[PDB]
Amino acid sequence: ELTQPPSVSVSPGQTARITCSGDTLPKRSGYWYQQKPDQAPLLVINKDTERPSGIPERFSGSKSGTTVTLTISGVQAEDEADYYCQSADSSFTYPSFGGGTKLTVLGQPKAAPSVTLFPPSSEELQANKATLVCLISDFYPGAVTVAWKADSSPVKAGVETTTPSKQSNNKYAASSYLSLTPEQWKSHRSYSCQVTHEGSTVEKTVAPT
Amino acid sequence: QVQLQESGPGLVKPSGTLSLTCTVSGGFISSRNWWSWVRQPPGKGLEWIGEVYHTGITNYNPSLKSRVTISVDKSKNQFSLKLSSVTAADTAVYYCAREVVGPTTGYFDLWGRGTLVTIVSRRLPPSVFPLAPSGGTAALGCLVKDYFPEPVTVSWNSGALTSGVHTFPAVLQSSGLYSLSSVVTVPSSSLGTQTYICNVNHKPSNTKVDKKVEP
Numbered sequence: 001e002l003t004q005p006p007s008v009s010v011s012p013g014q015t016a017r018i019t020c021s022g023d024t025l026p027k028r029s030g031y032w033y034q035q036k037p038d039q040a041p042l043l044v045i046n047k048d049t050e051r052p053s054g055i056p057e058r059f060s061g062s063k064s065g066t067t068v069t070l071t072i073s074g075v076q077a078e079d080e081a082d083y084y085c086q087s088a089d090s091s092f093t094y095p096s097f098g099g100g101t102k103l104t105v106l107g108q109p110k111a112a113p114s115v116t117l118f119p120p121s122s123e124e125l126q127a128n129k130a131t132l133v134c135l136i137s138d139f140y141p142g143a144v145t146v147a148w149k150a151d152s153s154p155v156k157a158g159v160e161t162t163t164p165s166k167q168s169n170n171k172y173a174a175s176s177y178l179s180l181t182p183e184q185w186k187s188h189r190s191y192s193c194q195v196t197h198e199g200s201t202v203e204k205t206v207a208p209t
Numbered sequence: 210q211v212q213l214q215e216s217g218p219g220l221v222k223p224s225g226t227l228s229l230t231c232t233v234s235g236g237f238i239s240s241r242n243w244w245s246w247v248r249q250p251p252g253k254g255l256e257w258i259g260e261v262y263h264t265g266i267t268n269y270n271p272s273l274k275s276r277v278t279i280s281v282d283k284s285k286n287q288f289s290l291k292l293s294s295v296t297a298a299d300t301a302v303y304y305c306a307r308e309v310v311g312p313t314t315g316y317f318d319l320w321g322r323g324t325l326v327t328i329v330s331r332r333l334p335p336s337v338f339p340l341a342p343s344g345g346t347a348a349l350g351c352l353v354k355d356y357f358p359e360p361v362t363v364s365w366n367s368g369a370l371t372s373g374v375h376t377f378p379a380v381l382q383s384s385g386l387y388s389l390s391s392v393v394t395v396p397s398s399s400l401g402t403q404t405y406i407c408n409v410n411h412k413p414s415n416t417k418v419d420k421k422v423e424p
């Protein structure tokens with residue numbers, strides 16, 4: 001019953017507008033909650049326009065009949081979060097929630113990835129398996145490509161790579177796993193993980209003990 | 210101030226009953242507020258389950274209403290949720306919450322910290338492998354390979370080591386199994402002298418391992 005956009009993006013210091021639409025808003029009012037990862041929701045606007053004490057003054061709310069709006073002025077990186085609007089149904093029997101709006105704050109400074117590459121553990125080799133682990137951290141923007149090499153030949157099979165995900169310091173992290181047989185691992189002189197980010201490359205190499 | 214805290218089993222078998230309790234501290238269950246349960250499947254939105262008044266009157270989400278029991282116990286200053294005949298759709302973080310209810314409107318003014326409850330059907334225990342590590346810093350870690358379902362928790366040295374710890378998001382492999390790695394960045398000088406143990410817990414398969422990571 002309550003409609004909000006799934007995403008909104010703004011640059012640092014700009015103003016973000018998040019709207020919520022629903023026929024019950026005039027009579028049942030709207031309430032706005034902020035939710036950060038691994039945290040419970042936090043009420044940021046009470047009854048359309050009231051700001052709770054303890055909420056920064058840059059949060060404000062407005063009402064426009066079947067629509068209510070959360071406005072965040074001078075948006076900061078710390079405001080990146082999910083925002084939920086909430087009302088009640090027309091019979092005042094049940095609460096209603098919007099789907100949530102993810103607010104993304106752009107303009108973060110470019111950052112090159114750090115790469116760590118681990119060879120197979122002795123325990124894993126004894127299990128007749130081999131996994132190489134390439135860990136990529138602290139980069140921005142959140143797009144990277146990973147290329148594996150056996151000696152100097154490309155390896156495409158057996159590669160599993162995550163989609164980059166934002167860390168608690170607002171930079172991105174990703175990981176890539178290469179599965180090999182122990183025979184493959186011992187046959188070649190080395191294996192490499194090549195990580196490309198904004199046209200620049202970092203390469204790590206490991207070799208059998 | 211009033212504080213709310215959920216407790217109860219984090220794992221439920223399919224068709225079993227989820228059971229959670231909210232302990233209210235710093236105030237009385239008896240008050241003008243209503244008490245409620247809200248859940249949030251990983252990566253999804255909020256869904257209200259139901260509410261209870263201190264006298265016992267209840268009101269539930271009609272889409273769940275046949276499977277929901279919400280009760281109050283003033284002697285213990287707690288309220289509880291039972292959700293019967295669970296399926297995978299019921300895996301979520303469950304929050305207890307306090308509602309402020311007026312004649313024509315209501316909202317949520319206080320939340321517990323949330324507790325994940327996972328309905329576990331198929332499961333697979335991971336293998337846990339050390340990632341062994343001159344000057345400068347050194348990286349060492351633990352690989353938690355091929356588990357299902359999520360999640361796994363990783364800590365280091367029983368939680369005494371937090372600085373430099375980076376537990377990476379899990380990868381969903383083409384096999385439909387998860388893997389993840391956790392890495393600690395430590396001074397190379399502390400290697401020969403400091404012991405590093407990764408504490409892995411995959412509760413759905415009761416895989417609880419403390420793995421020593423040595424050169």
Ligand SMILES: CCC(=O)N(c1ccccc1)C1(C(=O)OC)CCN(CCc2ccccc2)CC1
Pocket residue numbers: 087088092093094095096243260266267268308310311312314315316317
């Ligand atoms: C004594 C009967 C009674 O009071 N109520 C009631 C009505 C029918 C059946 C059972 C109980 C309610 C009511 O009418 O509000 C006084 C129905 C609505 N509930 C609020 C829903 C809500 C929660 C959170 C945010 C927004 C909305 C509160 C109780």
